[PDB]
Design an enzyme around this catalytic site. Structure first.
Site, mmCIF file in Angstrom:
data_model
loop_
_atom_site.group_PDB
_atom_site.id
_atom_site.type_symbol
_atom_site.label_atom_id
_atom_site.label_comp_id
_atom_site.label_asym_id
_atom_site.label_seq_id
_atom_site.Cartn_x
_atom_site.Cartn_y
_atom_site.Cartn_z
ATOM 1 N N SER A 1 0.779 -1.258 0.000
ATOM 2 C CA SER A 1 0.000 0.000 0.000
ATOM 3 C C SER A 1 0.801 1.294 0.000
ATOM 4 O O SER A 1 0.280 2.317 -0.418
ATOM 5 C CB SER A 1 -1.036 -0.009 1.105
ATOM 6 O OG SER A 1 -1.915 -1.083 0.715
ATOM 7 N N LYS B 1 0.522 3.380 -3.118
ATOM 8 C CA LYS B 1 -0.502 4.426 -3.198
ATOM 9 C C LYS B 1 0.090 5.820 -3.208
ATOM 10 O O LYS B 1 -0.514 6.710 -3.752
ATOM 11 C CB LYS B 1 -1.556 4.305 -2.140
ATOM 12 C CG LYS B 1 -2.330 2.976 -2.216
ATOM 13 C CD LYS B 1 -3.253 2.819 -1.022
ATOM 14 C CE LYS B 1 -4.281 1.749 -1.387
ATOM 15 N NZ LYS B 1 -3.758 0.400 -1.269
ATOM 16 N N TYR C 1 -11.268 2.876 3.652
ATOM 17 C CA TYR C 1 -10.016 2.539 2.905
ATOM 18 C C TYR C 1 -10.164 1.438 1.812
ATOM 19 O O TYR C 1 -10.616 0.345 2.122
ATOM 20 C CB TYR C 1 -9.001 2.146 3.956
ATOM 21 C CG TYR C 1 -7.594 1.938 3.444
ATOM 22 C CD1 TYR C 1 -6.919 2.918 2.724
ATOM 23 C CD2 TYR C 1 -6.937 0.752 3.713
ATOM 24 C CE1 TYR C 1 -5.595 2.706 2.301
ATOM 25 C CE2 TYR C 1 -5.638 0.528 3.309
ATOM 26 C CZ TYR C 1 -4.961 1.496 2.594
ATOM 27 O OH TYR C 1 -3.667 1.222 2.207
ATOM 28 N N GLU D 1 -1.089 9.911 4.896
ATOM 29 C CA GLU D 1 -1.765 10.283 6.086
ATOM 30 C C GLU D 1 -1.011 11.398 6.742
ATOM 31 O O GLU D 1 0.224 11.337 6.872
ATOM 32 C CB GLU D 1 -1.957 9.059 7.011
ATOM 33 C CG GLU D 1 -2.878 8.056 6.322
ATOM 34 C CD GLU D 1 -2.887 6.610 6.915
ATOM 35 O OE1 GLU D 1 -2.238 6.349 7.926
ATOM 36 O OE2 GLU D 1 -3.505 5.731 6.257
ATOM 37 N N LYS E 1 2.689 6.397 6.081
ATOM 38 C CA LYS E 1 1.907 5.414 5.361
ATOM 39 C C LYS E 1 2.534 4.039 5.630
ATOM 40 O O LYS E 1 3.751 3.903 5.515
ATOM 41 C CB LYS E 1 1.893 5.674 3.904
ATOM 42 C CG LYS E 1 0.963 4.773 3.104
ATOM 43 C CD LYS E 1 -0.510 5.054 3.388
ATOM 44 C CE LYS E 1 -1.393 4.048 2.674
ATOM 45 N NZ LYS E 1 -1.500 2.925 3.633
ATOM 46 N N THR E 2 1.718 3.089 6.122
ATOM 47 C CA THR E 2 2.107 1.690 6.179
ATOM 48 C C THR E 2 1.710 0.983 4.880
ATOM 49 O O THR E 2 0.786 1.387 4.123
ATOM 50 C CB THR E 2 1.379 0.981 7.379
ATOM 51 O OG1 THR E 2 -0.025 1.226 7.322
ATOM 52 C CG2 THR E 2 1.845 1.457 8.613
ATOM 53 N N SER F 1 1.669 -3.278 2.999
ATOM 54 C CA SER F 1 1.935 -4.713 3.057
ATOM 55 C C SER F 1 1.498 -5.419 1.790
ATOM 56 O O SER F 1 0.501 -5.021 1.176
ATOM 57 C CB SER F 1 1.155 -5.347 4.222
ATOM 58 O OG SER F 1 1.501 -4.871 5.510
HETATM 59 B B1 LIG Z 1 -2.269 -1.964 1.797
HETATM 60 O O1 LIG Z 1 -1.018 -2.556 2.434
HETATM 61 O O2 LIG Z 1 -2.890 -1.110 2.881
HETATM 62 C C1 LIG Z 1 -3.252 -3.132 1.228
HETATM 63 C C2 LIG Z 1 -4.246 -3.739 2.217
HETATM 64 N N1 LIG Z 1 -3.681 -4.773 3.070
HETATM 65 C C3 LIG Z 1 -3.752 -6.107 3.117
HETATM 66 C C4 LIG Z 1 -3.020 -6.493 4.226
HETATM 67 C C5 LIG Z 1 -2.780 -7.874 4.727
HETATM 68 C C6 LIG Z 1 -2.692 -8.081 6.123
HETATM 69 C C7 LIG Z 1 -2.484 -9.390 6.583
HETATM 70 C C8 LIG Z 1 -2.335 -10.466 5.666
HETATM 71 C C9 LIG Z 1 -2.401 -10.271 4.281
HETATM 72 C C10 LIG Z 1 -2.254 -11.440 3.292
HETATM 73 O O3 LIG Z 1 -1.665 -12.528 3.576
HETATM 74 O O4 LIG Z 1 -2.712 -11.310 2.126
HETATM 75 C C11 LIG Z 1 -2.626 -8.947 3.823
HETATM 76 N N2 LIG Z 1 -2.569 -5.402 4.843
HETATM 77 N N3 LIG Z 1 -2.978 -4.280 4.135
HETATM 78 N N4 LIG Z 1 -2.483 -4.209 0.616
HETATM 79 C C12 LIG Z 1 -2.919 -5.009 -0.366
HETATM 80 O O5 LIG Z 1 -4.068 -5.048 -0.774
HETATM 81 C C13 LIG Z 1 -1.890 -5.883 -1.039
HETATM 82 C C14 LIG Z 1 -2.357 -7.299 -1.220
HETATM 83 C C15 LIG Z 1 -2.894 -8.007 -2.293
HETATM 84 C C16 LIG Z 1 -3.158 -9.345 -1.981
HETATM 85 C C17 LIG Z 1 -2.805 -9.653 -0.663
HETATM 86 S S1 LIG Z 1 -2.148 -8.287 0.182
#
Ligand SMILES: *[B]([O])([O])[C]([C]N1[C]=C(C2=[C][C]=[C]C(C([O])=O)=[C]2)N=N1)[N]C(=O)[C]C1=[C][C]=[C]S1
Length: 356
Positions: free
Chosen positions: A61, A64, A147, A269, A309-310, A312
Site C-alpha cells: 500500500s 498508493k 479505505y 496520512e 503510510k504503512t 503490506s
Molecule cells: B495496503 O497494504 O494497505 C493493502 C491492504 N492490506 C492487506 C493487508 C494484509 C494483512 C495481513 C495479511 C495479508 C495477506 O496474507 O494477504 C494482507 N494489509 N494491508 N495491501 C494489499 O491489498 C496488497 C495485497 C494483495 C493481496 C494480498 S495483500
C-alpha cells in the site's frame, strides 16, 4: 551526533527480526540531507543472499503514494482535474453511475460504496470494466471514509488514461525518472530478478505478489532502500526537483478532510506534529482501516505537519514517515509482515531520539 543513528536503529528495529522471525530488513534514515542505510539479514533464506542496497522489496500500500504523486503530476500538467469524473477519460463509463463520483473522492476513499478489496471473482480487464459499469452508489458520498484498493485503483487507471499511457509506463517512464529513482518498478525486469527478495508468509514459505485487478496503482510497486530514501528526500525538499514533480509532491501533502486526529491527504496520512504515539497507531486501528467512518472538514490546520503510510503484501512489510520541519524521515522495509503498530512505534522512538 550522527554516530547515534546506527545504535538507535539497532536498539529499536533489530529486535523485531527475532521477535517475528523476519528473514531480512532494511531501515533508512534521512536527517539534514544525510542518508543512513542499515541492513539486516537475508533477502533470500534459501540462497543465503544478504539484504543490501540492491535488494528490491514489495511496498504494498505504500505504492498508493506513487499513485497519488502521479495524480498530482497530471493535475498540474492540466491533464486532469480533481472535481472531474471517470467518464471524461474512460469513454466506456461516460454517463453510468460511477461517472458521478469525483477523482478526489476516489483517491481519498469516500465514494459511498467501496471496500478494501475487489471480490476474488474480479480479475480480467473486462471484469473490472464491467464491475464499474454495473456499479451503483450507496452512502452519502463524501461523508464516509472506507479505505479501498478499487477506489484509488480506479483513480490510478483514470490518471493513466489522461496521460495516454498505461499506468505502469506512467510510473516507470515519467514518475520514477522525475524522482531520480534508479531501481523502482511496477514490473521488475529480468536483469533485476536476482535482486528481488523473496517475501515470506506466516508459515515462513517464500512468496511474491500475485497478479490482481488494478494491482499496479493500489499495491504494485517494488523498490530498494536507496530509492525510498530518495523519495523521502523529495517529499522533505521538493524545491530542488523539476517544477512538474514539485507541484505533484506538494499536491500530495494537502490535507483534504479529518477522521478524528488523522488528516487524509493524497496517498499520505497527515498529523499535527509533534503527534502522540497513540495518534499514529489509531490511523492503523481496526476502527480506521477496516470500518466506515464519517469524515469532517479540517478544523485545526496544523502549523507543523508529519506524514506516514504503512504498506503490506502477503510477504512484505513497509513503513514510511517524514517530518518536513525537522528535516527527517525513516523508511522500513521487511520481507515478512510484522504488525503495523510495531513499525510505527520503533520509528517513533528513533525519530524522537534524533529530534535533537
Ligand atoms: B495496503 O497494504 O494497505 C493493502 C491492504 N492490506 C492487506 C493487508 C494484509 C494483512 C495481513 C495479511 C495479508 C495477506 O496474507 O494477504 C494482507 N494489509 N494491508 N495491501 C494489499 O491489498 C496488497 C495485497 C494483495 C493481496 C494480498 S495483500
Amino acid at each position: 551526533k550522527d554516530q547515534e543513528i546506527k545504535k538507535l536503529v539497532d536498539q529499536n528495529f533489530k529486535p523485531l527480526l527475532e521477535k517475528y522471525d523476519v528473514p531480512g530488513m532494511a531501515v533508512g534514515v534521512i536527517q539534514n540531507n544525510k542518508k543512513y542505510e542499515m541492513y539486516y539479514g537475508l533477502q533470500s533464506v534459501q540462497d543465503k543472499k544478504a539484504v543490501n542496497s540492491n535488494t528490491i522489496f514489495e511496498l504494498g500500500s505504500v505504492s498508493k503514494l506513487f499513485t497519488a504523486t502521479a495524480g498530482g503530476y497530471a493535475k498540474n500538467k492540466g491533464k486532469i482535474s480533481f472535481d472531474d469524473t471517470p467518464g471524461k477519460y474512460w469513454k466506456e463509463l461516460k454517463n453510468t453511475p460511477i461517472d458521478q463520483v469525483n477523482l478526489l473522492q476516489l483517491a481519498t476513499y469516500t465514494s459511498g460504496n467501496l471496500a478494501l478489496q475487489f471480490p476474488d471473482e474480479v480479475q480480467t480487464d473486462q471484469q473490472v470494466l464491467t464491475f464499474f459499469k454495473d456499479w451503483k452508489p450507496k452512502n452519502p458520498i463524501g461523508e464516509y471514509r472506507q479505505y479501498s484498493n478499487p477506489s484509488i485503483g480506479l483513480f490510478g487507471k483514470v490518471v493513466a488514461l489522461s496521460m495516454n499511457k498505461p499506468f505502469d509506463q506512467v510510473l516507470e517512464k515519467t514518475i520514477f525518472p522525475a524522482l531520480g529513482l534508479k531501481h523502482s518498478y511496477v514490473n521488475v525486469p529480468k536483469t533485476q530478478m536476482q535482486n528481488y527478495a523473496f517475501g515470506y508468509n506466516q508459515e515462513n514459505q517464500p512468496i511474491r505478489v500475485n497478479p490482481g485487478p488494478l494491482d499496479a496503482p493500489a499495491y504494485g510497486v517494488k523498490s530498494t532502500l536507496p530509492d525510498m530514501l530518495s523519495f523521502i528526500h523529495a517529499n522533505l525538499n521538493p524545491q530542488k526537483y523539476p517544477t512538474d514533480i514539485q507541484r505533484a509532491i506538494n499536491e500530495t501533502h494537502q490535507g483534504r478532510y479529518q477522521v478524528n486526529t488523522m488528516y487524509q491527504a493524497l496517498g499520505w496520512e497527515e498529523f499535527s506534529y509533534p503527534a502522540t504515539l497513540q495518534t499514529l497507531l489509531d490511523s492503523n486501528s481496526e476502527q480506521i482501516v477496516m470500518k466506515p467512518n464519517k469524515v469532517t472538514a479540517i478544523s485545526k490546520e496544523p502549523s507543523v505537519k508529519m506524514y506516514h503510510k504503512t504498506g503490506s503484501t502477503s510477504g512484505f512489510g513497509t513503513y514510511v514517515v517524514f517530518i518536513p520541519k525537522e528535516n527527517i524521515g525513516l523508511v522500513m522495509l521487511t520481507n515478512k509482515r510484522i504488525p503495523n503498530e510495531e513499525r510505527i512505534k520503533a520509528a517513533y522512538v528513533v525519530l524522537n531520539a534524533i529530534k535533537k
